Design an enzyme around this catalytic site. Structure first.
Site, PDB file in Angstrom:
ATOM      1  N   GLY A 146       0.789  -1.211   0.000  1.00  0.00           N
ATOM      2  CA  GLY A 146       0.000   0.000   0.000  1.00  0.00           C
ATOM      3  C   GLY A 146       0.832   1.276   0.000  1.00  0.00           C
ATOM      4  CD  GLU A 147      -2.399   4.074  -1.330  1.00  0.00           C
ATOM      5  OE1 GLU A 147      -2.377   2.873  -0.995  1.00  0.00           O
ATOM      6  OE2 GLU A 147      -3.228   4.533  -2.144  1.00  0.00           O
ATOM      7  N   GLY A 148       0.876   5.624   1.616  1.00  0.00           N
ATOM      8  CA  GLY A 148       0.773   6.323   2.882  1.00  0.00           C
ATOM      9  C   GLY A 148      -0.321   7.370   2.925  1.00  0.00           C
TER      10      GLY A 148
ATOM     11  N   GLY B 120      -4.353   5.166   3.266  1.00  0.00           N
ATOM     12  CA  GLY B 120      -4.264   4.044   4.178  1.00  0.00           C
ATOM     13  C   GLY B 120      -3.366   2.945   3.649  1.00  0.00           C
ATOM     14  CB  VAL B 121      -0.623   1.005   5.199  1.00  0.00           C
ATOM     15  CG1 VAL B 121       0.500   0.139   4.652  1.00  0.00           C
ATOM     16  CG2 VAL B 121      -0.076   2.317   5.740  1.00  0.00           C
TER      17      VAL B 121
ATOM     18  CG  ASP C 229     -10.678   8.798  -7.720  1.00  0.00           C
ATOM     19  OD1 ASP C 229     -10.144   9.728  -8.362  1.00  0.00           O
ATOM     20  OD2 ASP C 229     -10.114   8.219  -6.767  1.00  0.00           O
TER      21      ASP C 229
HETATM   22  F1  LIG Z   1     -10.292  -2.686   0.960  1.00  0.00           F
HETATM   23  C1  LIG Z   1      -9.464  -2.363  -0.071  1.00  0.00           C
HETATM   24  C2  LIG Z   1      -9.792  -1.300  -0.867  1.00  0.00           C
HETATM   25  C3  LIG Z   1      -8.945  -0.973  -1.910  1.00  0.00           C
HETATM   26  C4  LIG Z   1      -7.796  -1.725  -2.165  1.00  0.00           C
HETATM   27  C5  LIG Z   1      -6.879  -1.363  -3.269  1.00  0.00           C
HETATM   28  N1  LIG Z   1      -6.655  -0.052  -3.480  1.00  0.00           N
HETATM   29  N2  LIG Z   1      -5.769   0.021  -4.505  1.00  0.00           N
HETATM   30  C6  LIG Z   1      -5.273   1.171  -5.061  1.00  0.00           C
HETATM   31  C7  LIG Z   1      -4.387   1.070  -6.095  1.00  0.00           C
HETATM   32  F2  LIG Z   1      -3.882   2.188  -6.661  1.00  0.00           F
HETATM   33  C8  LIG Z   1      -3.997  -0.168  -6.574  1.00  0.00           C
HETATM   34  C9  LIG Z   1      -4.493  -1.312  -6.019  1.00  0.00           C
HETATM   35  C10 LIG Z   1      -5.401  -1.228  -4.947  1.00  0.00           C
HETATM   36  C11 LIG Z   1      -6.115  -2.131  -4.149  1.00  0.00           C
HETATM   37  C12 LIG Z   1      -6.030  -3.601  -4.273  1.00  0.00           C
HETATM   38  C13 LIG Z   1      -7.167  -4.395  -4.153  1.00  0.00           C
HETATM   39  C14 LIG Z   1      -7.038  -5.761  -4.295  1.00  0.00           C
HETATM   40  N3  LIG Z   1      -5.885  -6.376  -4.556  1.00  0.00           N
HETATM   41  C15 LIG Z   1      -4.807  -5.603  -4.687  1.00  0.00           C
HETATM   42  C16 LIG Z   1      -4.825  -4.228  -4.567  1.00  0.00           C
HETATM   43  C17 LIG Z   1      -7.498  -2.788  -1.308  1.00  0.00           C
HETATM   44  C18 LIG Z   1      -8.336  -3.114  -0.259  1.00  0.00           C
END
Ligand code: A1BIN
Ligand code: CL
Ligand code: CL
Ligand code: CL
Length: 305
Positions: free
Chosen positions: A17-19, A22-23, A129
């Protein structure tokens, strides 16, 4: 807390994840071994969003391309959402293919995005988005390995009442929310977003895939508000035919069509998919599901990233 297990059944694994949003972590269901994506969010935060995102997945449950939501709750000072684990984003595969998708790949990816966005609109939501970063493919060896999915509904908004189907009133002077590279012209002008704006953003992504860049990228400005203004000004100045130079003209016809939709009108999704599908008939290509990233690393797919 060695061997941290959140949600009773979900083993915390690898950070992906990113910062800012949320991670995000990889996870494994400790009952059946299915992989999951576990998203953390601070509890006492200035922007609470993870609760309503869990209810968006539950609302869209059963839709092809929307991951299942399995758990949401409070553990410590963190809200936790557990959904299916998916593969790389179309932005990731974009980078790996040299930052340019073939016409056949763009068309097939586009008709799946139009179907995903349509399904979102069916349940009375607008995504607001649209970006290639949020469209993910499946995992290797799975049945939906190369199918497109849609995640991250923190910007999702109800655009019509679920019972009477009364569209939200049109207003203006709204704060610019979204990424300026893909947002519609109406969003640059602070107008209320609707179904037409999710599709115009898709049209920007289609030209982004086809050309490798958009003419409003890399624009400089002293502030961010004036930078969003410069980008929106280039979008009105550039006709769809100019964006479509050297490309199949159906993509310009798509962008111009969705830009002409009334605020509360229901877009012709199937007419748009048939419009992009006629590109393959004009070029003598089949819609067989073969994508560019499927030829990476020697007809093998992505790896190590
Ligand atoms: F509950 C959640 C909500 C959103 C996410 C989520 N946000 N996101 C943002 C990106 F830019 C790329 C990928 C990504 C994911 C993701 C979901 C499932 N498998 C891998 C990555 C994960 C969990
Ligand atoms: Cl809002
Ligand atoms: Cl940019
Ligand atoms: Cl790779």
């Amino acid at each position: 807390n060695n061997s941290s297990v959140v949600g009773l059944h979900y083993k915390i694994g690898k950070k992906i994840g990113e910062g800012s949003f949320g991670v995000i972590f990889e996870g494994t269901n400790i009952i059946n071994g299915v992989p999951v994506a576990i998203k953390f969010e601070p509890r006492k935060t200035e922007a609470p969003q993870l609760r309503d995102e869990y209810r968006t997945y539950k609302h869209l449950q059963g839709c092809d391309g929307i991951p299942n939501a399995y758990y949401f709750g409070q553990e410590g000072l963190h809200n936790i959402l557990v959904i299916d684990l998916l593969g790389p984003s179309l932005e990731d595969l974009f980078d790996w293919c040299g930052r340019r998708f073939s016409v056949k790949t763009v068309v097939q990816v586009a008709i799946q995005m139009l179907t995903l966005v349509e399904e979102v609109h069916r349940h009375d939501l607008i995504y607001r988005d649209i970006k290639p970063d949020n469209f993910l493919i499946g995992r290797r060896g799975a049945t939906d390995e190369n199918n497109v999915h849609l995640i991250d509904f923190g910007m999702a908004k109800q655009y019509r009442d679920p019972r009477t189907k009364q569209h939200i009133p049109y207003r203006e002077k709204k704060s610019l929310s979204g990424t300026a590279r893909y947002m519609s012209i109406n969003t640059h002008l602070g107008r209320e977003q609707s179904r037409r704006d999710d599709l115009e953003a898709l049209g920007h992504v289609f030209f982004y895939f086809l050309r490798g860049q958009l003419p409003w990228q890399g624009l400089k400005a002293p502030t961010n508000k004036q930078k969003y203004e410069k980008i929106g000004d280039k979008k009105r100045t550039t006709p769809a035919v100019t964006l479509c130079d050297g490309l199949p003209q159906q993509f310009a016809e798509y962008l111009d069509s969705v830009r002409s939709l009334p605020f509360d009108a229901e877009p012709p999704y199937e007419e748009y998919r048939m419009l992009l599908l006629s590109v393959l008939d004009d070029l003598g290509q089949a819609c067989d599901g073969d994508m560019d990233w499927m030829h990476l690393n020697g007809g093998r797919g992505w790896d190590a990233t």
